[PDB]
Amino acid sequence: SNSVFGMIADVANDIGSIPVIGEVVGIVTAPIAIVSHITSAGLDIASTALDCDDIPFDEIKEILEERFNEIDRKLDKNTAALEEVSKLVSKTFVTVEKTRNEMNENFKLVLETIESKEIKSIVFKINDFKKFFEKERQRIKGLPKDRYVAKLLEQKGILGSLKEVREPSGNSLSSALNELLDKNNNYNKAFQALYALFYGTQTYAAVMFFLLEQHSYLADYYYQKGDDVNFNAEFNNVAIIFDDFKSSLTGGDDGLIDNVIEVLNTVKALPFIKNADSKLYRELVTRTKALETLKNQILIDDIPETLSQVNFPNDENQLPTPIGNWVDGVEVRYAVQYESKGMYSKFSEWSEPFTVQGNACPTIKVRVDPKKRNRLIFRKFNSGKPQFAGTMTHSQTNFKDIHRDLYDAALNINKLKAVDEATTLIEKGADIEAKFDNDRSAMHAVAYRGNNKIALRFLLKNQSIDIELKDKNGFTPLHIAAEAGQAGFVKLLINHGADVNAKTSKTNLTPLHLATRSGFSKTVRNLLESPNIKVNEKEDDGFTPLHTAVMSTYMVVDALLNHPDIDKNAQSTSGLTPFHLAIINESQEVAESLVESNADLNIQDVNHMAPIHFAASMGSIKMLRYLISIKDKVSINSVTENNNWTPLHFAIYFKKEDAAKELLKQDDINLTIVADGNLTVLHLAVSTGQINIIKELLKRGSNIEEKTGEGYTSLHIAAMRKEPEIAVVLIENGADIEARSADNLTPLHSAAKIGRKSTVLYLLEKGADIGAKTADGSTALHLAVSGRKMKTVETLLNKGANLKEYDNNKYLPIHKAIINDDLDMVRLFLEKDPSLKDDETEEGRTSIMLIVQKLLLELYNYFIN
Amino acid sequence: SNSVFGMIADVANDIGSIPVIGEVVGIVTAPIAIVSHITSADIASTAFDEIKEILEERFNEIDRKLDKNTAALEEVSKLVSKTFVTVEKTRNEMNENFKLVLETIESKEIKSIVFKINDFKKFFEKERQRIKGLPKDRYVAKLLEQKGILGSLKEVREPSGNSLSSALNELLDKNNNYKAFQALYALFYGTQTYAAVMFFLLEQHSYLADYYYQKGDDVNFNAEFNNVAIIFDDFKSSLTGGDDGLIDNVIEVLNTVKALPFIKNADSKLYRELVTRTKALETLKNQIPETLSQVNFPNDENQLPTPIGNWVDGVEVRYAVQYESKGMYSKFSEWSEPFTVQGNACPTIKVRVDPKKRNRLIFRKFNSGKPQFAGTMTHSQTNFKDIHRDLYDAALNINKLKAVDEATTLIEKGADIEAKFDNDRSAMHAVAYRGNNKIALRFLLKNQSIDIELKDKNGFTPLHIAAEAGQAGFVKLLINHGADVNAKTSKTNLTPLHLATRSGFSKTVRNLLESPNIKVNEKEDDGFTPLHTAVMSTYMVVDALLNHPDIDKNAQSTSGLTPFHLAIINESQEVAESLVESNADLNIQDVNHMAPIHFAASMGSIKMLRYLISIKDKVSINSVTENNNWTPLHFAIYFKKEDAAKELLKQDDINLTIVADGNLTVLHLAVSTGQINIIKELLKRGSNIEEKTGEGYTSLHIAAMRKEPEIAVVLIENGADIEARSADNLTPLHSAAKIGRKSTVLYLLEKGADIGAKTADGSTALHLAVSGRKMKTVETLLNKGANLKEYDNNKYLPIHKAIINDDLDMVRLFLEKDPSLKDDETEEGRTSIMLIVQKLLLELYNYFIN
Hints:
Two copies of one chain form a homodimer.
Chain A: H1 2-15, H2 25-39, H3 60-72, H4 84-109, H5 119-140, H6 145-163, H7 170-186, H8 189-223, H9 228-269, H10 276-293, E1 336-340, E2 343-345, E3 375-377, E4 390-392, H11 399-410, H12 415-426, H13 441-449, H14 452-458, H15 463-468, H16 477-482, H17 487-495, H18 511-516, H19 521-529, H20 545-549, H21 555-562, H22 578-585, H23 588-597, H24 611-618, H25 621-630, H26 647-653, H27 659-664, H28 681-688, H29 691-699, H30 714-720, H31 725-732, H32 747-754, H33 757-765, H34 780-787, H35 790-798, H36 813-820, H37 823-831, H38 845-852, H39 858-863
Antiparallel strand pairs in A: 1-2, 1-3, 3-4
Keywords (chain A): ANK repeat, Cleavage on pair of basic residues, Exocytosis, Membrane, Neurotoxin, Presynaptic neurotoxin, Repeat, Secreted, Signal, Target cell membrane, Target membrane, Toxin, Transmembrane
Region (Helix H8 is the probable transmembrane region of the tetrameric pore inserted in the target cell membrane) (chain A): 193-212
Protein name (chain A): Delta-latroinsectotoxin-Lt1a
């Protein structure tokens, strides 16, 4: 179940939950655990042998936050769309890596032997190189941004020398080709070696890819607030990397073309004996030819210039004016570069930081460039700015830099100073609403910062822009201010109104839902009053605004509880009321407020669990006490509609054995609950192996013996429990030693199957009957000789107390051993068990039958005795 | 011996009472020397700076530790230190047999690599021991540059591991084949060494980060946290992860050779408990970004921009916030976002960006290192940080009128004092540490219940801060309330009187003594009194305590330290005179049973020595003790304080008739020293030349058994007998022979010593010479006391020992070179033959028969 449930966890990883940020670590871990439990539902005993029952219970969470951090390592919507390179290469990588996934077992099989030829040693060495690659690959993806780039900053050169592999075995492959020529001519070991050479080629190509995307991510990191200058260096490095890539690929693929030629030559010239292994080989030859044709699918335009190309000295409205943010004296770190058609070329050359008390109006000959490539300049002052000063389609005259200046003025936090900045800019009145950082940054940002009063009263011309203006992420200004609590400006916007139920472009959500977790009771009332918005709104994932409001736990939920016409209860995608979250989010005040508003609508989830069982699952001791203090909703003693389980069963089954003690100490608990298999919760505890609650229930007078419909008894469970103390524990409790199966399978037979000799000897001093026998008539001796457990059958022969007699079938236990044919045990049995094997059966024919049955070895002739 | 005093040093190191200035570095170094003397308290001994060097370096190591409530990662530091000690115990234990491995040399060719890893061990040990010797500044300075070398080493250990796995392959080969035991033991040594080195590196980096916390660079704090995380992850992958670390290989080798049907040495069993330790260690080892982007408070009311110097006008802002208060304190850097902010201090701090179940503490900064702290609470907070910050800032200022202005303004602006800062209650106790005008007490007067009982991080009350600050006026201003003058702090519970004595603000302690109503008689940690702290203070302030209260002037401590001895150590003659005038001399013999003159000799303070001489009152210059009746003169004898020794010699009542244990007198001590000039001065004074001992030894008995002859020349100038018998009748010739100094016997015989002396046993000088078997001694005997051929009751002739001791040339001198001419030397002359035949003898013994 470890691998299969790990794959289920990887499926949950591919879900990518955190974009809909409603996943608390608890509310993502505990549901995953219960999902695993439900998918592995059903009860037995073989699981309870520590085979597949509870092997993982917590460390799966490790992979869970793995999934989360690999998810969030993705670029936070990098303003440049240059990530299409990484996207393409990852798409190519997925298929090749799956093919390598099958080739993994293929070439674990390919390990059939070593040194059929001397080249096979080199094959093994390059195999070890591959396994080095695979070992290094796993650790890479885990770490978050800072640690990720830290690990990046050293292994890149190692990988570069790995592609230019320290031992360029290609000529060794060519020599292997020359040898396998004759090797295939003679008839194959070289037949087995073609798989190896092809696998090496695949690993080669995969390593080239891996280098490529790691470089691409490094470039991305240096792009978004990274090393600005080193972005250009890294891009040139990856360009040269691609050049050497292509050239060495042409050479290696000339070799591979020779390989294909000789493969066809062998196919035609060979006799008609081959391997279907080579048939899958030829299918992958087709695949590799496709990937070979794939190779053809793939700043100078930007930076042969400086800023002083065409200086604009001065004129009206742009005279040198001392303005705070536009400081007079600090550098002018100009930088113009390319982006268009998704393609992006970014340079970093602030070659002219020349400072004057003048104006930045000069033009840089943008209008004359013949190439139809869109350009963009960004002019830092003293350090790496957000890098989006001015986007010019065909011309820049500082006007878009002026737009950025207005944008920055909108980022001020001083109110009257912001008004003064607004006056200064409206002297010229640059184009508001211009998009920066791929965001409709002007109006959204001014709404975020505030002073929406002045912005509205000066620029109230387009309410549609005020409402349905969406950014790179597809964000309305309402969503912009949702988590930012511009309550007064919420009145400002609602005065002319806005889309109450606007949905963002990706992971469609109300701005209300965005504001739900902000805990802004002073802001939410505005939407709560004016339009009477749909309180029962469900996003792309069916979580109520109430659900998304349980996060804050503040008085916002209390205001929302009852004042409007609310869906006081609902059902989530997996069947989760806000009461479920309140139980799990551990906000006791909100739980009490909800109890005040309405009674507990203890509706079960999709897999038939009420919020009661979660507390037993995670030992929610404080809420456990509070819910007992409710004194009502006695569903703590109810059952799962799925399979009739109380929360006590889950508490015992998760080893969280404190809330169980609490519940036991609460009141007169009903332990007579029966579930799938008629297994008492006592039997479940016996399987788990917790003596404390065991004797605790014993004090509460729990019924020791209620035979289950599964055929087992708690005595058998103890006989198979690896903790031999529990059987004795039940012994002083007075548990009947004859707590046997309906099939009369005593736990002696169980232990004979198990091999737990200590519990065997236990039952020996306890004097369990040895002359007894189960339904087929077989004493536990027969089961043991079927299983052939050495020390167990030794103790048996010590205390067999049986005459080695015929069962329902005429076999003696020695005949059972004969059928087993355990030659060492057969010889052990022949004499130490007194032989007397003359006329044992009718004329002693049983042995004679075993002669005349078939061709029998002379070993049996010796065993005749 | 030396290790015993090292253990005593360690015990002294453990307790923080000596870091408490109630005992000072000199004041603790001196008792170490005297305790070394006491534990040291003959004959063979006749034939200390390093101790105090060890003490001072260990106290420096204690000083290297950081302050209380300083930084984070402290649980990691503590646990890693604990397991580091645990590992180092076993490593030190196993080092001995690791060395013993290096004797079965070259049964294997990889023994060169074994020597290589041994040299690796030597390098590591030298570096790590060289680390633990420097003060904090030198400590961090040394760690700085070589942190890179240490990090390099962290991987440069790789060929050790690779060659070690290869060696373990060959070792499984060897053990399953049968000398591999030593190599497997070296395997274990490599494993333990790797683990220990890694833990050492982690602990060192942790402490370095902790130091960087104290106004260093938070960016550097993130860098160091990243480094420690990466190193621990390297550990995990290398030795615990899915990749099979060497521990898996060693466990499988143990299991495989466990099935070996062979009988093997106890080395395997010891390695088995070693592997038990390894798997226990294996089980042990196998287990925020947000910003006030927009929300500046608008003028709801009372923002009222004031030109506050504290909240500087025109500067920018910086900020970050991290989680603390339970276990770890994950740390983060977000100063990319801070930018210019002016107008009035009104940032709506907005904790609620991710209002999770964590206590996130924002620390606020600007251009340089800043106060960098603002409040703590889960839910919404509304910029009371500004007001509280300026509040403790006013409490911290030194311009009292400005403090008045700020206190008047900000309280009206709206906040509460009770909220802490820097985890301190600085807005309330910086008041005591800087003094306060009336309005501080006026504002605090409303409750009369906040500041008085206000425990700090260390639990101090304003009593303690005021007492150390010595702000006597503000001391009265507060004690108008009259709180617990006995407010003992949480750690190192003491009285504010102790603090005042330590500081030296006499006005404050006079004010305390004006209306104490206190138990001034407090006895602190080591049985001391506040009078002892005053003695440390070395000022006339002690007079106020001396006169008015009723303290025990004759106060003795746990170690036997009187205030007299403390003054002697400190050497303030004015204070000593004041103490003498106060009450009686506490010249009582202490726990070690010493006298103040003993310390006067110990430090060699001739100033205080002469002052005590001029006292003449109870100045028991010839006082002896219960333990061996040591005199201060005796201590001056041992410590070779020759100047003070002769100085006191220039006085009258210098008792030359001192009898110690076994009658080892002052002249005997002078002999045992070797300072000849002092002995000559003593003889000029005229002590008993032939002062004897319990074993009937004159001073020349021991002077002879020395390594220089000129001392015997001085004694014979004095006129000591050259044939003075002993209890064993060991004449000076006998003593001179029993050591092996030929020149001593030479000068004895120049004066006419009796060569023919022979003890009751019959041990003639020839017998002693052959007993020492020295060729020079025996040839001198043959020169003078040639051959008496004596024996015991069992007739052991000199030739009998001469042939037992197996020396060739001397036997030839007896029989061939200068023949003894004695054939048939014994009864029928076959006692020699009797010894030839008695039992098993030597292959080469045939010539020794002669």
